[PDB]
Every structure is written in C-alpha cells, then in structure tokens.
Design a binder for these strands. Structure first.
Ligand SMILES: [Mn+2]
Ligand SMILES: [Mn+2]
Ligand SMILES: [Mn+2]
Ligand SMILES: [Mn+2]
Ligand SMILES: [Mn+2]
Lengths: 437, 437
RNA sequence: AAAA
C-alpha cells in the first residue's frame, strides 16, 4: 500500500528520460511526467509528445500521471502549477530525476518536492543522468550506477521517442543490389573488397570521377533514353584522344576491368575492353536494364556495402543485433514531413552513431555532408549522438574538416569524426575503435 | 563593505551569461564565475575558455572570481569545491543567475548559496534568462524584465565569446564588386534589381542555368584561357540543334539583354545582340578582363548584393549600425582552424541571424546549404541563433526543406527559415518580418 | 539559455 513515485522532467531530449525510466521502472509504483504546455505567446512549445512516447515505450499505462506546466521559464508559475496539479497522495518515497527540462524547472521542481515531502516517513531522492560518463548519479550519495552497458535501445524505439515513424532499413541478407545483380553480387563485392584491401581505393575513385562519371553522368535522365546517351557519347568522341571514351578503353587498370567484368553479362558497361556504345534500335528500357543499376552501384553505393560488410563482422563478435542495433540505408520521417536517408546506423548501448559515407575527395562536398550527418543524428537520436563521416579525402583534409565542424558540448570525446581514404582498407577496425571506447 | 556579488554558472553557451552580465554589471561589486575543469577520465571538458571571455568582454578585471569545479555531475564534489573556493568575505547581497551549466551544477550551487546566505537575512536572489521570450526571471522578487531590446551585442564580441577570431566582413560602401565595376556597378545592380522586383527572378535563374552556365562554366579557368574557351565554344557550335549559343542569341529575354547591356562595354558578355566570341587576336588577359568578373557576378554573387541592398535601409531605420549589427560576407576562424564564410549576418538585440544565399533551385544543393547555415550560426552565436536560407526553389520545395531540417528545442518560433524564388521581389520585408516580428 |  506504500506508494513510491518516480518523477521525470520532460524536456526536448526524451532519450535520458527513457534510460532513467528503463533502469528504475521496476522499483516504482507511480510515475509523474512533468511536461510543458504549448503557449505561442511566450514562444513555448509543448513536450507532451515526448511525454506520450515515454509512457508508450516504457509501458507505464495507468501508473503514469501527466503534469503540465504553463510556463517552464517562470519560477512563480512553475511552483503554482505544482501545488495545484502534483498528485496529493501518501507516498513513502519520492524520487525526482532532474535531468531534463529547463533550469528553472529543475530547481523549482526539486525544491517544491523536497519541501512537500520533508516528513521523514517520506524519503526524497534526487538523481541525474550524466551524459559524459553514462552514469546515474544520486544526490548526496557516492553511488555511481553506470548505465552505459546495462540499458539498451533499438533503432525503432530510439527514433519513435524522437517522434520519427515509418522506419525502414536493409540487412546484410536483404541488401537491394543483391537482387539486382543475381549470382554475381558476391563476385562484384569480393572484387571490390579485394581492391580496397589492396590500397587501390584512391585509384578507383580517380577512375570513377574520370572517365566513369564523365561518360555515365552528364544529364538528368541520360541513361534513361538511348538517344540522349548516344548524343552524349558522340559529343565525347569529338574530344578525340583526350576523350573520356579513349581513357576508358585504353587507360583503365586491370583491377577495374576485373570489377566491370564481374557484373552479369546483361548488366555490363563494356563490350570486351571497349565501352558498350548503344546502337540505334536499342530500347530505352533495354539501355536502363543494362546500365542503370550498374552505374548507380559503381557511383558510390558500392562503398556503402563495403563499409557495412567490414562493420558487420566485428559487430556480431560483440552483442549487437542487426536490425535493432545496426543496419544500412536507414530512412524515416516525422509525420507529414520529408524522409531522410542515413547510410549506416550503429547503436552502442543507448548512443546512436550515424555514419555518412562518400567516395568524394573534395573539401566542399565532404564539408556539406559533414553538416548533414551532424544535424541528422541529433534529430533522430538526440543531442548526445555521435556522427561519423567517411570520405575519400587524405589525412590532412579529414583533420581540417574535423576541426572546421567541431562543436563544443562539454565533453572531451568528439561527437563528429571524419575518416579518409587511408582508413578504407581497415575501416572495420577504425569504426570499432572509435565507437566502442 | 556593503558588497553585492553576482554569481554566474559558465556552461558551453556564454551568450546568456554575457547578457545577464551586461544587464546587472553596474550593480554588483564582485563576480563569481563558476566553471568546469577538464578531466578526460570522466569525459568532461572545461568551460574556462568561456569564463575568460566573459571576464574580458564584460570588463570585470579584479572584481572577477574564477571558481573551478572538478566534477560537474557529482553533487558531493560540487559542494566541496563551493565550500573551499567561494569567497569568504561578508556580502550584503548574493545574486545567482543559474541559467548556465549542467543540471547538477544548477541544483547544488543554488541550494548551497541559498543555505549560506539566505539563512543570514542577507539578500539572496536567483534569476534565470528565458531563451524563448527574452526575459530575466527573478525567483524572490517575482519580476520578469524583458532584455530583448535593452541588451545589445556586436558581431566581434559575439564571435569572440564563442572563441572565434580574425573577424572580417564587407560594408555597403566597401563591397568587393563595386571595385570590379567602378562607374558601372550601380547601373548593373539597379537593372538586376528592377527585374527581380518585377517577378523575373524565376525566368532569370532558368536562363542562368541554360544557356549561361552551359557557355561560361566548365573546366577550371575556362574564361581565362582563350584556347580553353574557343575550343569549348566550337564544341557547342557542333551541337547546333540544341546549342546554348543559339539559345543565347535568339531565346534570351529582353530584360536579360538590358542586364547584359548594363555592364561596361569592355566587360559585356554580348557583342551587340549576340554572344561575343573571342577572336585569335584576343589574349588570355583580354578574355579574363572582359568576362571573368562579369560571369562570376551573374553566376550568383549578384544575389548576395541584391538581398543585402533590400534590407540595409530598413536595418538603419531600426538604429542598427552596419559592421556591428549587420554586414555581408562574414569570415572568421577558431585558433589554428579553417575559416567559414557567411553570406549575410544580422543581430536583433542579442540573437544572431545568419542568412545563407543561393540562386539554386535544386533540392539537394539547397538542403546541403541548409545544414550548413544551421551549424554555422550555432558555432558562432550559440544554441539560440536563427538560420535563414534563401533559395531559388518554388514554394513547395521551400516548405518541404523547412520541415525536413526543423529541430525541436522548445520554442514555437522556427529558428531555421527557408525563403524561395517567390520571395525575392519582397525579400526585404520577408526578412524584416521574420527577424523583427 | 529545455542529458552544460
Ligand atoms: Mn546515402
Ligand atoms: Mn553517402
Ligand atoms: Mn584580420
Ligand atoms: Mn557563398
Ligand atoms: Mn551563398
């Protein structure tokens, strides 16, 4: 009959409240979720949506009481709303975790509760989830409960509490290009993996920019219409010896011919050691069926698979579960809002690690992709997520970019990490060292 | 004697401490800056850099007391540090603004100071700077003074307290392209301005894609090497069916001819009513003297000047001073770090408004520039800065991009705003309404 | 300045 209540403060970061809730839920009879009301006149949005998500993914059910605060910036109104709305019941223990919310929410929820339950029959406890060392810290108690490895969360819960829905991703066994290149994907990927393991990555991306991209990427729907692709071919042919066609035919290294000749016969860009030039009477659907998937894969997607295959090995040696804690081609939306696409996600405990991939060696483009991955991981995983960008740049540029985009949040470990071309051969070990540390 | 001390908690956002420090400085004799020490074992960085900037730009001098904390997540270590390091002098008033720092800093600094001084009939007060409605909220006096229009800050001190240095920007009177087109820039910009205010912006940017960019953009230094340009032009001529040269001569709207003819004769892209083709007598220097500056301005730099010219008069009416509170092409670095450039900066009170500009109508490029301006205003202005991205996209893409990149921080006012092609003619009022209302 |  002795009721114990846990109190959480619902800010705009639901993850710490999920973690503290997951750890302490079994020891408490009631839960008071203190959230903000929506008042446009004071520029105050509501965190009720996060409070609902916390109730849903913690299975609080009837034990949950929602307490709205009219003004989360004004002490006088916080205290008034607390006296009016805080549950007036016989509690034998009141535990406030003051991790979330505004500063004035924290001090005045703390002191209101410590005063209302000063009777020694009622034990008051205050706790705080330290984001830097992953520890639940109790007030006036040396107790330091590390929750880094004990509390776990899957990608679906993590995105759901951050208000994202329609979560889709691919597995090692459901990778899309495995279907598009039947009976050959392993041969293609092994040939590509062998080349990257042989320090041929820079040679590969150089050939991909010139002459690959100058031939197969020049217009919006170039590879969708045989006439436009043939027109693009004739224009290049006019550049004579210096044409990309000649460099493709005459200056393509053997390891790149082997990669091209691993694709299925009906989906090869080459006829022997010569660029397949479509003739007239080639249907647009015949051209697309032969070059669309092959060009799109050779145009960057191969690197998403390569890095994913290097990570999956070492992640399975650990406790990670594919689909719940890592995956490829993550996509989701907020309601009535555009979708995003994240290359690779990894969850180490309850920390999201989003990984953005590119073969580009250009500072400007890699920089923009650096901004992109930083904003995405905070949208879907909260403000303590880590962003990793894997580029084709050399060591000097990756260190430059890392310092360029570094933002200070009070921790000593970087939340934005950049890898470059020299890390491709052992990219699995590099990620494992950076993530699990 | 009769000493009144103000206490500030130094987190990773120095701006609220600067605003509270500027507002209350004249009324307090001593200032206690409570900051964190660096300890990589507990993944805790130090905010001493911000504390030093706060002492410098508030001109506290020997009235400033630095109070270091060893562990900002540990209730006990916080109190031990407070007992041993807080000034032992007799104070008649102790005012603590608890806006910054961790939640455990806020709780245990508040309750420590409250017991030490409010128990002695000494004036103890606590305040909190509301980020959403720009109000300094007092706990005991129950006051909430709006500092929105009373506290000011300049781009130099704003960037400095956020640890940025080497701050450069251009004035209206020092705009770079005013030197490239002396005696002609006004005519050039006024002709472009008249067209954009006539809703010709969409037609202009489509012409800039084709055939302008098809003709004057290609290999690096295309417009500075006559052989590169003339060979490139001969290739376009062989595509006489869909030649950009034919489209230039025959399909160019009259308002663009007026723009092209607004340039000085030696810097026109047109020879009369057709494209100027360099003869073999034209040297590399003549070609660059005629075309290089004109093309770069028409390629998008004109839009930077246009937007800046549409707001400058309205900013001066609001008593904002150029250079301090607004400017164009802001550049700065962190120590030994790459520079950034921001097209336009604006400061309303103490909120930074960073404005990124592009004539592009493509989703992906505008999206990548959206991530960029969001991060940059965060780095140089703190977590409450506003980011505006002005694009050449239609209204549907503009609304999509806002929702795509929106991030929840607790306010009802959007801090990422996107404008599109349909906003160009009235961009001065659109910005003025978004920023100051 | 709503896990500093
Ligand atoms: Mn991708
Ligand atoms: Mn990618
Ligand atoms: Mn300088
Ligand atoms: Mn620019
Ligand atoms: Mn720009």
């Amino acid at each position: 009959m002795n009721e114990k209540v846990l109190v959480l403060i619902v800010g705009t970061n639901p993850l710490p409240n999920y973690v503290v809730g997951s750890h302490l839920k079994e020891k408490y009879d009631k839960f008071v979720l203190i959230y903000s009301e929506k008042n446009d006149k004071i520029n105050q949005n509501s965190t009720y949506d996060y409070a609902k998500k916390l109730k849903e993914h913690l299975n609080l059910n009837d034990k949950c009481i929602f307490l709205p605060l009219s003004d989360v910036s004004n002490s006088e109104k916080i205290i008034n709303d607390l006296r009016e709305k805080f549950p007036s019941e016989d509690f034998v223990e009141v535990h406030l975790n003051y991790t979330g919310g505004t500063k004035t929410m924290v001090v005045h929820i703390y002191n209101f509760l410590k005063e209302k339950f000063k009777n020694n029959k009622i034990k008051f406890e205050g706790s705080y989830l330290d984001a830097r060392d992953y520890k639940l810290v109790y007030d006036y108690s040396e107790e330091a409960i590390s929750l880094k490895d004990t509390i776990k969360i899957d990608i679906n819960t993590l995105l759901s509490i951050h208000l994202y829905e329609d979560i889709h991703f691919e597995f090692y066994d459901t990778y899309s290009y495995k279907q598009k290149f039947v009976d050959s994907f392993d041969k293609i990927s092994q040939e590509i993996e062998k080349a990257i393991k042989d320090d041929k990555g820079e040679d590969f991306v150089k050939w991909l920019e010139d002459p690959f991209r100058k031939i197969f990427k020049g217009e919006n729907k170039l590879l969708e219409k045989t006439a436009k692709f043939k027109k693009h071919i004739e224009k290049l042919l006019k550049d004579n010896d210096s044409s990309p066609i000649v460099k493709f035919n005459e200056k393509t290294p053997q390891f790149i011919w082997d990669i091209l000749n691993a694709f299925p016969e009906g989906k090869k860009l080459n006829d022997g050691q010569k660029l397949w030039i479509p003739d007239d009477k080639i249907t647009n659907d015949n051209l697309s069926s032969r070059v669309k998937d092959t060009v799109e894969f050779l145009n960057g997607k191969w690197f998403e698979w390569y890095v994913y295959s290097q990570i999956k090995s070492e992640l399975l040696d650990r406790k990670l579960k594919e689909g719940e804690h890592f995956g490829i081609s993550l996509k989701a939306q907020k309601k009535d809002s555009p979708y995003f696409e994240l290359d690779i996600f990894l969850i180490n405990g309850y920390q999201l690690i989003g990984i953005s991939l590119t073969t580009s060696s250009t500072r400007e483009l890699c920089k923009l992709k650096g901004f992109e991955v930083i904003h995405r991981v905070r949208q879907i995983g909260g403000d303590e997520s880590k962003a990793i960008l894997i580029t084709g740049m050399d060591k000097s540029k990756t260190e430059d970019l890392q310092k360029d985009l570094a933002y200070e949040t009070g921790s000593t470990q970087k939340r934005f990490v950049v890898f470059g071309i020299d890390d491709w051969a052992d990219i699995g070990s590099k990620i494992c060292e950076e993530v699990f540390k």
